[PDB]
Design a protein around this ligand. Sequence first.
Ligand SMILES: *[C@@H](CCCC(=O)O)C(=O)O
Ligand SMILES: *[C@@H](CCCC(=O)O)C(=O)O
Ligand SMILES: *[C@@H](CCCC(=O)O)C(=O)O
Ligand SMILES: *[C@H](CCCC(=O)O)C(=O)O
Lengths: 303, 301, 303, 304
Amino acid sequence: MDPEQIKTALGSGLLSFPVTHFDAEGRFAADSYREHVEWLAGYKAPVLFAAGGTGEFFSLKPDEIPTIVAAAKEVAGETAIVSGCGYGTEIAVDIARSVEKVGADGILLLPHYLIDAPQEGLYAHIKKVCQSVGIGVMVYNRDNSVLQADTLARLCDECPNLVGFKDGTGDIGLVRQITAKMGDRLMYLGGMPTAELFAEAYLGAGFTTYSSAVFNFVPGLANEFYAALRAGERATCERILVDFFYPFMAIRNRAKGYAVSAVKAGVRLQGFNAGPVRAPLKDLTNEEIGMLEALIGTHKRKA
Amino acid sequence: MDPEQIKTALGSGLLSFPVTHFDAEGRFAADSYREHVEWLAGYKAPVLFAAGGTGEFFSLKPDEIPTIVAAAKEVAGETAIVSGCGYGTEIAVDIARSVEKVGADGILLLPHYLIDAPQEGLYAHIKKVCQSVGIGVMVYNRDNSVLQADTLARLCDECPNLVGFKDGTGDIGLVRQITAKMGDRLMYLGGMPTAELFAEAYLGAGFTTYSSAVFNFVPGLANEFYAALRAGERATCERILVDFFYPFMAIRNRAKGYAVSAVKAGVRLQGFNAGPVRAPLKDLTNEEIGMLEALIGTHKR
Amino acid sequence: MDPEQIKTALGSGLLSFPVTHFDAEGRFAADSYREHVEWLAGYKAPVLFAAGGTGEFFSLKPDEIPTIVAAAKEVAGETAIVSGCGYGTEIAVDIARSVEKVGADGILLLPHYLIDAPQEGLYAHIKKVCQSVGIGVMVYNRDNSVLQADTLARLCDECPNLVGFKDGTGDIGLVRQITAKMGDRLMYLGGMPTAELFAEAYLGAGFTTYSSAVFNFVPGLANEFYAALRAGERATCERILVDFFYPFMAIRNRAKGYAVSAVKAGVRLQGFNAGPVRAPLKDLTNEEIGMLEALIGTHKRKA
Amino acid sequence: MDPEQIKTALGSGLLSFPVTHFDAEGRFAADSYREHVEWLAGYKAPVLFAAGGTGEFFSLKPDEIPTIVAAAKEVAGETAIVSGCGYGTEIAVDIARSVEKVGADGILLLPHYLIDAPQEGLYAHIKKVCQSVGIGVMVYNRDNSVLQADTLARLCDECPNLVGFKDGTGDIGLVRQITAKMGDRLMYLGGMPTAELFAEAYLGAGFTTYSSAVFNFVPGLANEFYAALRAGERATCERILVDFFYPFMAIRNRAKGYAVSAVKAGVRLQGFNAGPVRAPLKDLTNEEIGMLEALIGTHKRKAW
Ligand SMILES: *[C@@H](CCCC(=O)O)C(=O)O
Ligand SMILES: *[C@@H](CCCC(=O)O)C(=O)O
Ligand SMILES: *[C@@H](CCCC(=O)O)C(=O)O
Ligand SMILES: *[C@H](CCCC(=O)O)C(=O)O
């Protein structure tokens, strides 16, 4: 898949970030993974982000990532596969090239590690990672890596395979400046945790799709919220927000990291053997898991 | 008017916040203010907020506020006038009652002073202020006073004259939860500094309308954006954003307080003797004034 | 006093900020105020801050402040009396003068209202307030009013009655640069909530003394800790922190504003008729007063 | 050495973190590195941190870190050598064992990568890295990894080789609580960028010592500030703060990352070809380098 093709796919529907499955011993569980990814397939997300932040990228050994990408590819079907990438330039470049080789259709470039960095250095970092590969690249504003509109424009002019922008800052004023400035030069992806809480405002800002972490365990509900979004059916979105997403928010807000941990708890409750999180996330308590199962309720997958 | 009549007016169009005029001596300049306000009401803003944030409420003596509202109300015409309010509860009540008595159509309750507060404290504070008058109150989320949805719904049950919510947090997750929760129990006002930057997303979040600071000096342009916004002209909105508002933000971001100071400089440049800002704001340098002057350009009054 | 006289008094002992008593309705209750203050006077604090933050300045009418100040210095004795001041420039001077005409030995200029301001603006504001009175002024670094050292040096060189510096920021780097730059031109008062947690560090940073809020209800403990701190008794300071202060911090951290609320719950526990906090503060629940009571323990005032 | 010995060396003087030298192509430059480190040895810092934050740990490939630790070990003499370590648990463990293997005297565990994490997770992550090696371990509070006192207590009880605590928060309230609770169970290192700005308050808060980035290029000056601090020569410290540290601070605050870039520039100015920083740091401008060279003034090691 060339950069323009992954670009088109990014704009053709809802985006899903599968959790990464671990056995009791914390090693990658490829059979469980594929099973979950085969099931998600039936709901026809156009792009699958393998080993994103929902997939606990920040806890993966670098040589684990190609293995997880290839597992997804086996059962993904006609779904474009994008791989997480990140860390400093030297590691990111080696990851990017490792997943290109196993057939990734693009990379999602998560922040570099630890330091706050001037816009100059950001530009220099991302330019080299983009130049390391021929596949499509999506950048990702969050935490210690926040590209300004001017800087992003420079990267776009100089790196044709840079085709997408994921936002995790919540900075409405900045992301509207970015879509105004760049136009159709980039596909714009909402990437806040529980992005449905943000989807309608982001529409207005120029974002017509987002990553839906909850699609991991209630894809039917996520597909419905998305269809309601694109059709302008505001009473339907509002109902789904009050009935499911705000109550999910309250479970998520009980501890740091639960934007990943509550999602993986939901996978397990729906009968997929996703297993535990790697430290330093912690898994939900039994009580908390009980509150989640009750919320899933009518959307339970088995008994 | 009654709370429901201001509620309706509040959602009926673009809202404006006139700067407060001062003179050499430093006192409020009433006739100047009156000739500025009168010029604005001719651009058909349904509601005017006298002595709000942009009207430097934070730098106003309690006694001054009813004179400014009086001045505004004199030449407001068909436009309704909502008055700034604020500080701690005791002063807030005292201020509320003074402006009701000179016929304020409503109250915009700015946050209390200095301290952080629990939700149950904000409840008691806002409740006490609402109940001391009969006119409509709009609460204002920003800084040290941020109402959660459940606390807000609690106030709305308790005080029927609380009819509006103004955001200045830019917390787009929170404000969508507030509109989803309350529904039409409230009117929702975009109140970010230079809110045109947030207007398209605020509407997606379900906001009734927003307030335009820059309307103070380029009301024609503010009206143009607002109409293109309501009629879906995304490309026209984009042009005005790119050519005017983002260059304005580059001037505003040069220093703290310029959300007010640059607006005020805009007013003077168009021939209204608005005077300086009061400490601890500072006025634009002569360079910055010229930048803003250059940016106004074609719109020069 | 003259400015140099309150300057001198400010540096010669442990200072504190008496809570303002309200009746249950409730306005200022000067009877209960005076008896509470008189009991504190016997604990020999040399400077007394009437209507400061701990005394809910932020919730007082500008009329109530001279009344509170006069109520204070009636029973204060030879103890010096400093008044709160604050809000915008215009209100601030009015309050400044108000309390000077009822005998205040100086003023603590609390931050201006709401907005963020330029250094130059902070300069013009504080300069005008200093030149409105003849009594001594101490500035207060906190929230939206944070003076840098170059700015502070300019105010010192323009307003001779500006003689004290209270920090509420906890910014170590900044206050060490301030004491380095100004030398003995200013008296430096540590002003964090529960400043005892910070006292051992602020000495090293060059700070003359600090404010003890808990002096309100356990002034024996505050004098025991302050004495050890000055004598270089680390093991004794360390005991009282492990035993009292970090437990008191756990309660104080239960809710916003409890840096005053928990202190006023402590005063009422020792039989002083302080009454409620004014909104938007709230009072501790019964359970939390229970918690506090158990902690006060042996230091409980008795007949 | 064993954990108690490194604990002792950690408490015995001023500590420093050498920049990592790179050639123009960004590769590790070991010739220049050992040359610079041999110079830092003459000034007798009792502990040397190779590939710490000042040494651009966050930009090193994991396989580079053992090579760097080995180079510094060649010319360090009797100075203890501690290795940077970090990222999430799996990577951190591999690095930890790799540097134990080339003979490091301990590790400094930088924060895990990207995410805010609950105290229980930090416990689990740090406990697993400690248990992976036999050498001394120092924890490092900063940014997305901030241990509470109660959490650090349990790690201390569970992991004997955990012997040190470096602070990067500047949270004086919290670090006082931490020394009050742990006592001499741990040695305490001040670790703010330009820690001399903080040294006097931190000793007060009971910190065993601190680490001086600027020792990289004016170790004479850093040494004298340190002796003055320990002797209570307050006027001496204050003179050096006003004449050098606040001026350096003003250079350092002109851009993000210059807490490391400004130090590397200073090393270059002193005639050690430390080379450029790796992106996303950027190097000082020629102009800014000019300001740094004039500030260094009388403390120049060379004439150009
Ligand atoms: C981006 C999407 C954010 C959702 C989450 O972190 O759970 C990503 O996962 O990389
Ligand atoms: C609220 C924000 C209004 C900005 C505007 O004038 O549009 C306030 O200034 O009080
Ligand atoms: C810790 C010391 C901080 C100084 C700096 O980052 O320059 C470290 O370098 O690991
Ligand atoms: C000063 C701050 C004292 C706080 C404390 O010691 O807890 C003030 O209230 O103005």
